Each structure stands twice: as C-alpha cells, then as structure tokens.
C-alpha cells in the first residue's frame, strides 16, 4: 500500500556482507538528471510504497529524498549488475522506473564489457563499453526526456546516491515490489530479472 512520495525514508546504504553485495557497491554509477524528477526511494523496509504523483518537477526535486537500488546475476556466462532509479513521475504519468546494467566477463576478473541503459522498450547499448562514458569503473548515466524520459550514456559527471540492493532488502520490501501496481511503469529487478538481462544483452 501507498505512502506519500515525501514520506518514504532513505534506506541507508550497509556495509557490504558479501562479494555480491560489495561488486555492487564497488560499480555504483553516477546519473545525470538533465531534466525531470530526481530519483526517490520508492520503497521502506516494512514494505509500503510510494504513492507517486499525478502528472513542473518542483514536487520531485528535493536531492536529500535520493536513493539507487540493484540486484546482481548472470546470464550467457557474464555477471550483470543492474542499477535501477524510481522518480516519483515521468503530460506525462504517475511513476517511473528505469534501469542500467554493467556487464562484467565474470565476477573473479570484473572487467567492465559492456554497458545497456533502458530506453523505452528497448535498451540502448554500449559494447565494448566506451571509456568516455566511464570515470574510472563508474558509469555515467543521463536522465532526460526530449518523448517520455530515457535513460542513456553520457561524457557529463553525474551524481551518486545510497545503493539498497535487493539482496539487502528486508522480504517485506521485496515482496511489495514483486506485487505492487506502478501503473505505466514497472519495477524492472522483480520476477522479470532475468528477462530485462535478456533484453540489456549485448551481442
Ligand atoms: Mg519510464
Ligand atoms: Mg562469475
């Protein structure tokens, strides 16, 4: 059930417990919100949600309110991590959920080998990954509409939030993703995980 989109608490970022949990942390991107919402936590540990906002962004532009989620996994022998912000809304409609992934050759040797970012549909991809879009190991993603908004890559510096990921979710959390209505957008790191890795593929 839904709480007021202001309301929802910023889940503080742990200590890592585990190499999944730390490769994540470790590869946090940074996004650049051009225009539009900043990114809200969109979920607390007792499982209520945000209720979201009825389609300027003055209502979804506060930068303390900022969170990032992902889950970790691995597909055609690669280890993917997926990287996955919520706005408040996108006339436009109440809600947004877009994603990112970084591909790695496998978690031992962890070189980047690729970068997808969701676009609608689709997935725009970058393969090999282009080392404009990386500041170091970190990603630079944009968040802009020009069309509803996208997600894409980009030389410019962006900005970091908290990282809960889904393997450090309390059930009740998750559980109210797997199930709850955002209407026009969809919780992309449910039970559909594994099918958004087939569509981020690069090759
Ligand atoms: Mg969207
Ligand atoms: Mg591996």
Known sequence: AVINHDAVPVW????????????????????????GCQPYAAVNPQGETSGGLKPQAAACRDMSKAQVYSRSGTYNGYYAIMYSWYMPKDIGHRHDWENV??????????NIVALSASAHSGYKKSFP?????????????????????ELGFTTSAGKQQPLIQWEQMTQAARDALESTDFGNANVPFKSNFQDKLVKAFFQ
């Open 12 to 35: 503080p970022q742990p200590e890592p417990a585990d190499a999944t949990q730390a490769l994540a942390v470790r590869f946090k991107p940074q996004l650049d919100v051009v225009n």
């Open 129 to 149: 990954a282009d080392k404009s879009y990386l500041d170091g190991i970190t990603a630079k993603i944009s968040y802009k509409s020009t069309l509803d908004h």
């Open 101 to 110: 992934v970084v591909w790695l050759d496998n978690a031992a040797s962890a």
